[PDB]
Amino acid sequence: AMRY
Amino acid sequence: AITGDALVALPEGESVRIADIVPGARPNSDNAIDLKVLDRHGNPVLADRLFHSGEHPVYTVRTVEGLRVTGTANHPLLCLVDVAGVPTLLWKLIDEIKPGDYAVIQRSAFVPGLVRFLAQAIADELTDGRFYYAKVASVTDAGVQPVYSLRVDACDAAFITNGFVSHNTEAP
Ligand SMILES: [Mg+2]
């Protein structure tokens, strides 16, 4: 989620 | 990621569809941009990436007043959650958001459990007033659509979409  | 219809809040009351930012963005592309956007506070910060993530299953989060945003299951929106009884801001993914939940809305574009709570810096971020806590009415499937997102220089890793507070992303 944070990575994307 | 969120659908192309989503309105990103630009300074001075302006806005733009996230699909209009890099018009003709190739599916599954990383796109360098230089754009001022509103952060979680109405302050201008830098967006320097426009991501076209391609076709994903999407879902529409609609509130009881009819505010709505459509995005992927792993899209994080800022909600107002009861942790101990202390109301606090947590990112819920769209797939884990459900009715009765409260979405945090940035009023610059348009506080449950707080009075029962009363630690002033607490009810000052919340009662900041540039916010608004909307009860969720539904989260319904919305087929498969093209989705987009941004990379921001902000310190909270957030930007505004349709009044909702969305989370920064590093890739498509
Ligand atoms: Mg859901």
CATH number, position B107: 2.170.16.10
Enumerate the active-site residues of A: 4
- Please tell me the distance from the alpha carbon of residue B61 to that of residue B53, in angstroms, as a whole number: 19
- Per DSSP, the three-state class of A3 is coil
Write the Ramachandran bin of B58: left for phi over 0, alpha for psi from -120 to 50, otherwise beta. beta
Which amino acid would we find at residue B76?
Answer: P
The count of domains in chain B is 1
The DSSP secondary-structure symbol of A2 reads -
B149: which chain A residues are within 8 Å (Cβ-Cβ)?
4
- Host domain of residue B105: 1-172
- Cα(B117) to ligand 1 centroid in Å equals 28
Q: Do A4 and B76 touch (CB under 8 A)?
A: no
